Amino acid sequence: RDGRHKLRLTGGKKKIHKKKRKYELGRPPSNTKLGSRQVHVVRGRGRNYKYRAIKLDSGSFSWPTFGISKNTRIIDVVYNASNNELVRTKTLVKNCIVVIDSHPFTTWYENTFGTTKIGKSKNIDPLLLEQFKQGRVLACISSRPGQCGKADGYIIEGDELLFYKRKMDKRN
Amino acid sequence: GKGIKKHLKRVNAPSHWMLNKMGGQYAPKTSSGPHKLLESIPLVILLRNRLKYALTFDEVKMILIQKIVKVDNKVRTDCTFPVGLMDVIHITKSNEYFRLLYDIKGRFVPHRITNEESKYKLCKVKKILLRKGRLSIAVTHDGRSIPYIHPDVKVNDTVRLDLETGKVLEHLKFQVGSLVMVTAGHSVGRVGVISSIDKNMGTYDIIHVKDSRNKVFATRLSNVFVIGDNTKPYISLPREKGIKLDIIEERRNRLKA
Amino acid sequence: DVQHERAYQKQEGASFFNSKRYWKKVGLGFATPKEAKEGVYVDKKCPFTGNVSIRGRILKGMVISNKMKRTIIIRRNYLHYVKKYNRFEKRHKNIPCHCSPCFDVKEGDIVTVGQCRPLSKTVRFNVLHVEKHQIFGSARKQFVLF
RNA sequence: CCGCCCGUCGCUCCUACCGAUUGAAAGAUAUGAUGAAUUGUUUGGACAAGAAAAAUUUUUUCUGGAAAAACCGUAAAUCCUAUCUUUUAAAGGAAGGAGAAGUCGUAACAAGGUUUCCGUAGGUGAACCUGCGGAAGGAUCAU
RNA sequence: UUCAAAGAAUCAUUCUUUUUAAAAUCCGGAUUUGUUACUUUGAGUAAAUUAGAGUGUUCAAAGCAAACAGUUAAAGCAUUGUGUUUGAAUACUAUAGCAUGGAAUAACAAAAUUGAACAAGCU
RNA sequence: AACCUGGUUGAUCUUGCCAGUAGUCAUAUGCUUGUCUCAAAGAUUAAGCCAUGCAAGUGAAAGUAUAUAUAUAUAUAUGUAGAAACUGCGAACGGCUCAUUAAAACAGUUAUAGUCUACUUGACAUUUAUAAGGAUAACUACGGAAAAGCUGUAGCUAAUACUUGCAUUAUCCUUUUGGAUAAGUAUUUGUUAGAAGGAAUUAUAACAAAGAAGUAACACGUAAAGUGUGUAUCAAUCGAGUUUCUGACCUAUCAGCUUUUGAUGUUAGGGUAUUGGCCUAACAUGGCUAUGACGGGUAACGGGGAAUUAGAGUUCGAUUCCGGAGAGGGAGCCUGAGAAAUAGCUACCACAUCUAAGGAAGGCAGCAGGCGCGUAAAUUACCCAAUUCUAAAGAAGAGAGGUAGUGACAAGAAAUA
């Protein structure tokens, strides 16, 4: 299923002469969603287990500027450069932009210096700040939850963030 | 079903085993181990076809059962254990010590050797890994990992390695004039000095090796085993001393006897 | 316009926030062009800018097409000896290569391509160095022994 | 030269062709329909181990979990077409080859008794004849 | 499009040494200079078969063995004990790929409604 | 041994075929055959069908024995065997055939900086304990079914089955001693820092987060304190998957193909052990082709090779080795390091066996053997002795393999004076 059964670039039918060799395995997609955590183990090749997350929430999210990370419930999926169907179904994949319950980062900031190891000097964006004010912040996912079994991700920043906002843009 | 192959057919056996076409259908199939089957040799062959201590596989097995044959000083009861290029065999009852070497043909001889020199073995490093705690480990052609190797050891050079204890004695860099043995194509037994190394960019680094008849021959760097500094070898070489004669010369030599 | 896709075209291996844009050397004496080091453009499968290491064969060709996006075709023209007639005969083979927009390549231009991993159904190569060259018929028809 | 021989027309044998017959047959793909089994997920919840109360029984919560079901996804198989390939029948038709001292002529070989032959068109029992333009492989290397 | 020239050996010929321009490199001396085809050396390849070396399988087809000394020891070599010499070569493994010496023969690239080389000056 | 003779004619010289002529690890068949050596042999037709038997098991210190037997030493102590079964490992090798398959496979040549890898080897570890928890087999008793390698119930009991779960090292001060700070292997994410390799987003180091699995609740009694079994990561190895380049027969009375059905590419993903239209979505309109694409044919598995050649070549290559594929036909899974396995399973189709008619099992292209087909091909033999494999690894198994039997396939030597 990872295999041939496909035209030959010249557009000639490869007359098949070989079954399907198990090492051409194409086991089917875990459309991993939001919800309470729930993950199965699929047994890949040499007992190499991999963790089909099927529901998720509490991924590890990073804040790249400051280069730190925190575990947060993720409250909604809002964009998917693959397809809008996935976002409709609220399915987490390796480049989904999603919304983090983003109090943790704020709390961390407060603990460290001010209110909304240390190479601080950068001191936050405007857009990001605004986002924080509502509690909830946009962030890519970066793990492939379907393989790794974790919704690990990172906060979307400056230029990329702007681009994603534009993409989202509402309007009509 | 289809997985790995357990058997070896006696014609498909690598020539320098020197098996028969008759005298069997199969060959021994070296166990996985510290050597590459095409450049190893199982213990069975050693016991039966080289030393001729055994007539049969059965006899070899029996011998092994008495825990009396050591290869690199720790015992082996696996009949088809691969012995390979440099390894000292200590048959305990005779108090014989062999070291495997190459002939001037491709063939393994067991060399015969002293107690004193037996205690070490040469080992060429292949890879030099960094591992946890920034500690470097060399990996020898003996499929053996030497940890905490002396920093000046580089990827191709040989290492005089003790057997009683896992630690190393000394190392011999892969220099422009370093006494070398070969271990692959055509010039296999050959022993030379090295003239020159090519150091090709994407490819195999070919090297040229002047003999003691001053006959230059080239070889891949892959399959060259450093054995000395220009003066003296750090091991006892066989009687021929790696001097692959011409065919005519060889014939003449044969005649004069 | 750099960001043309539905996704943000980033450049993996960049490192934006901390540290003292990303390109690499690719080796075998193929000089990374100015357009890779300068000149923003994101390419996952650029030899220099992206994450594909060229390794294996290097073979010169001559471009037939630019029609695909960031992807080129190169016919290798060569001579298959036939022992019966102790003569040769022109033969050929169209290698598809990935380009990367550091190289502006019109047709008939000589290129050299390194191997690299399977980038798509057929493109296993990418162009490392583009000699200029000029052509008058169709590149299709130019034999250049090489 | 009482030589050679040409074609129709009969007669016998064999070969392949055309052939109505939606001819037939098997196989191959391609479409579509239904669709066994089943990976995965979802629903399930026979029960087997806990937690709650009464003196072994009652009600409620947490675990693992069989059957059964639903949805994608692999997808056998069967049926229906379509197309193609392959053998294969057929009244009749029309060739060919073989044979037999058969019928009718005399076409060709000699200036073969209209030189021959070409291409083309029409003709005619049959060889063939005729027209037009070619050729000499002419019966003229020549005024 | 660098043709040639001169010296020594051998039985008119063969094999060898030396220099005749220009540019870069090295402490007046000394040493790098288009691409590919082609060719030469290699490298790297399973053996069996094939060619082929050795070996009286009684011959031979074979095989990959064997030979040697002795009514039972000498001789060797080992510090009473231990047989000894060995052999199972080599070449073939494309037409492609790898490195490689190359002077010929081929291509191609370089090259004027203008092309690049230096010395000075300015940025 | 670089070879030619007869045939057109009344004769001649050519062209030209026919005929002879030799060989074939090339089949058949006819007649004939006293030795010996060697030895192909149901490929060609039907990858047609199969009665019976056999072809993968495994225990010699070393998981589990109140089935049980037994010998010592003083009713206990050790022991020594041990049917059975659980566990473990193997059964993915081997063997067979050649139907498929014509840039596919295969050969050489790369590549894996794109991966997986049991056994074997070597390195070698991290966030009640004088010893933990049940619950299961064989077994006992009660059963059922015509039958099946069918299993029901109740009661036990082990395990190396299954499940828990107990200091020291590196960074800073003092004179080897006494304090301070840390302390997760893969794996994953984000942030950086960077002894090789031609080239690194490599090794590695740090920071912020998660995080499997593990580090002996095991068994012998060994060696000159050892071993077996198990175990995280790394490397080696036995490999495997993909992959680069180049290389194939006949056909143009196959010339345009491929693209809604992924054709060509880009992006993002999903999936994979990893790369990849491998799959999904979105977007391009590509890609191949007279140097033969795409079809068709092959009485095609590929190659190493075989025959025959002076030299070229031509034909063959089912068939000793390597590779591919397949186990009646497709398809689908489980186990496992490795299978899309077929003497594993599920299903359908096509064959087909037993049945008390309810059901049940079955797959010789393993070895023999039989029918069929055919021009066309051997014994239902003996053995593990050799060669090897597997195992709890001398000690057991092996139709793998070998030895004979049949054998005018071939090949060699050689009577009949």
Ligand SMILES: [Mg+2]
């Ligand atoms: Mg199979």
Ligand SMILES: [Mg+2]
């Ligand atoms: Mg007249």
Ligand SMILES: [Mg+2]
């Ligand atoms: Mg007439």
Ligand SMILES: [Mg+2]
């Ligand atoms: Mg006339």
Ligand SMILES: [Mg+2]
């Ligand atoms: Mg008229």
Ligand SMILES: [Mg+2]
């Ligand atoms: Mg008329």
Ligand SMILES: [Mg+2]
């Ligand atoms: Mg003839």
Ligand SMILES: [Mg+2]
């Ligand atoms: Mg006799």
Ligand SMILES: [Mg+2]
């Ligand atoms: Mg058959």
Ligand SMILES: [Mg+2]
């Ligand atoms: Mg057979």
Ligand SMILES: [Mg+2]
């Ligand atoms: Mg044992």
Ligand SMILES: [Mg+2]
């Ligand atoms: Mg038992």
Ligand SMILES: [Mg+2]
């Ligand atoms: Mg097999």
Ligand SMILES: [Mg+2]
């Ligand atoms: Mg366990």
Ligand SMILES: [Mg+2]
């Ligand atoms: Mg699509």
Ligand SMILES: [Mg+2]
């Ligand atoms: Mg076939």
